[PDB]
């Protein structure tokens, strides 16, 4: 439904709730074939520009085929071993003798066809381009004579159009050592992508999800080059499978919480750690530290579980009570009081300290609040921009309801002198033990 926010003054953090999530849990591989032409073009007396243009485009086809052949001859490097194993196993199955003959027989009459491999997977094979039919029917009888016959310019243009997709696919597979991502329209047309989504063994809500956010689906897919053998170019497209759809998700924004003394040597700082996207998954929480593992579209979010962390759900209680030992809520500490701002989903957190000019001007009315020293938050209702020093941030104007959850900033509960400020990343219980160790350090002396 409606996305809402809750800013926690106690922890200098904001949580954006209400997002409907789609987490990637599986891969669906599919074989995409291009029927190529094995030809031995032979020398004719040619001079006129049409014969040269045909032979030029024909040479770009021959060099593209030999370049793609040496690409499978020497492509041992792997870009991401943890995410292309499922497709690499299919290319290794295809490298067996007679398996390519199998897919060549099943896709003899239709563009799409299911093939049962010998290792059991039922993969979907698709012939998206047929250059062998065009070369064997329209080009070889014109340029395989004793002297070349003069072809009309319509054939030259239609052949540059058909050969272009081959040259661009060979370009992408060559510069990236056979593994390209995202999957471009050269790799897979929008018509082929929607038909492949429609033909997947997934729910209709999942086909509608991938179909209205096809660009996000493309950014989370891989294209792996298999083999060129017997006038066939085959490559596997690895598409994301969202086994969890419409799941509740939360977004944490964090900012430094310092004391407001006039002496940089008497101030201590603290910032909540593990900021990012949190999503519900089977009774637990999946945390995504990397920023590119979650693409967001409107209310919807599309995340990838390959590089994520599974934590108990009590970690969300760190947003309302961080000093609670029931969950070891981790923080980072320092003695560096530098100003910053974080634009949240429905507003903006501002940490202002020292000699710094913090303001929130509006395009239609001037500055309505000049922030004082400390950590604060502002809703997007009526606020357009936030200025911190000589830096200007923009507040997201999406409509929704913010809730200000009052509480005292926790930085006032710490003695500055015995604070561990160099300890960097640290659990709450680690800091509390460091404070019990400093009281043991004071009793004896």
């Amino acid at each position, epitope marked *: 439904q409606n996305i809402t926010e809750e800013f926690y003054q106690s922890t200098c953090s904001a949580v954006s709730k209400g997002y409907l999530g789609a987490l990637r849990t599986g891969w669906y591989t599919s074989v995409i074939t291009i*029927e190529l*032409s*094995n*030809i*031995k073009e032979n020398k004719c007396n040619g001079t006129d520009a049409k014969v040269k243009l045909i032979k030029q485009e024909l040479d770009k086809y021959k060099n593209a085929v030999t370049d793609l052949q040496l690409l499978m001859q020497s492509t041992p490097a792997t870009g991401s071993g943890s995410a292309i194993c499922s497709g690499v196993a299919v290319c290794k199955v295809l490298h067996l003798e007679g398996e390519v*003959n199998k897919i*060549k*027989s099943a896709l*003899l009459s239709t563009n799409k066809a299911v093939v049962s491999l010998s290792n059991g997977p039922s993969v979907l094979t698709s012939k998206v381009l047929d250059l*062998k*039919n065009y*070369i*064997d*029917k329209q080009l*070889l*009888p014109i340029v*395989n*004579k*004793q002297s070349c*016959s003069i072809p009309n310019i319509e054939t030259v243009i239609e052949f540059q159009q058909k050969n272009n997709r081959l040259l661009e696919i060979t370009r992408e597979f060559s510069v990236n050592a056979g593994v390209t991502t995202p999957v471009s329209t050269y790799m897979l047309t929008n018509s082929e992508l929607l038909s492949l989504i429609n033909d997947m063994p997934i729910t209709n809500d999942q086909k509608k999800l991938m179909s209205n956010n096809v660009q996000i689906v493309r950014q989370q897919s891989y294209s792996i080059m298999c083999i060129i053998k*017997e*006038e066939v170019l085959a490559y596997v497209v690895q598409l994301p499978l969202y086994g969890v759809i419409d799941t509740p998700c939360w977004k944490l924004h964090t900012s430094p919480l310092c004391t407001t003394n006039t002496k940089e040597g008497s101030n201590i700082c603290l910032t909540r750690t593990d900021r990012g996207w949190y999503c519900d998954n089977a009774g637990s929480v999946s945390f995504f530290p990397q920023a590119e593992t979650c693409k967001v579209q409107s209310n919807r979010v599309f995340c990838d579980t390959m590089n994520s962390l599974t934590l108990p759900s009590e970690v969300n209680l760190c947003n309302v009570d961080i000093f609670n030992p029931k969950y070891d809520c981790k923080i980072m500490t320092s003695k560096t009081d530098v100003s910053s701002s974080v634009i949240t989903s429905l507003g903006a957190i501002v940490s202002c300290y020292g000699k710094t000019k913090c303001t929130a001007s509006n395009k239609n009315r001037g500055i309505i609040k000049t922030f004082s020293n400390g950590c604060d938050y502002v809703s997007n209702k009526g606020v357009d921009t936030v200025s911190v020093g000589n830096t200007l941030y923009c507040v997201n104007k999406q409509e929704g309801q913010s809730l200000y959850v009052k509480g005292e900033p926790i930085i006032n509960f710490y003695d500055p002198l015995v604070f561990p400020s160099n300890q960097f990343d640290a659990s709450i219980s680690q800091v509390n033990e460091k404070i019990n160790q400093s009281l043991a350090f004071i009793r004896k002396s």
Partner: single-chain antibody
Amino acid sequence: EVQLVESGGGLVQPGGSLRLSCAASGFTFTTYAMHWVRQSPGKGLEWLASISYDGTSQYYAESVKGRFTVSRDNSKKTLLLQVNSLRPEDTAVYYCAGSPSGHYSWLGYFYAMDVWGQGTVTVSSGQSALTQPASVSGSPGQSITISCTGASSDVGGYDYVSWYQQHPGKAPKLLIYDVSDRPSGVSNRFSGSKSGNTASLTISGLQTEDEADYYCSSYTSKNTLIFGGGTKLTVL
């Protein structure tokens, strides 16, 4: 022992459908391309169809397009030709033939035929775009030459002309491929040439085994195959 054997035929009704097939033994199928060629009694040869090593491409002659379809099961090692809408003018001996080029699919890369079969009869009771001579008398120990005349699209434009020796009531054997090259088992005396629109096969030191009928074929620029009339050599 590269052996092809034809099957299906006998007597049949003018109308309905009819299936003909072939069998492969002595060679590797996935490397050979196939041909169907027929011959009315006491008449010349006529091309029909051809399929590539993978059965993907399949290109026919115009006179028979539609009523005929050629298929192949590489797993079971056979070649099939289905006949629909049989006509009284279709009664002929149907031959199975092969061509040695593999991994290629354009009809120009396997336009010659070197392996043949016995032939099966298809009879129903109630044709040469190339041109050769018929009468060619030759006394032994002399040299006579046969004229296969085409017109630019065939023979002329393409240095793609083949020559075959067929003995009365037997399979055709290959003599010349490309324009002058010959396969094994072929006597030196067999030798062929080309000059513009006309190719010519020459034979010197005539023997008795050589009294026979002889044919020519070429790629056609129309993606088909054209067969000549057939010349009767008489030894004296």
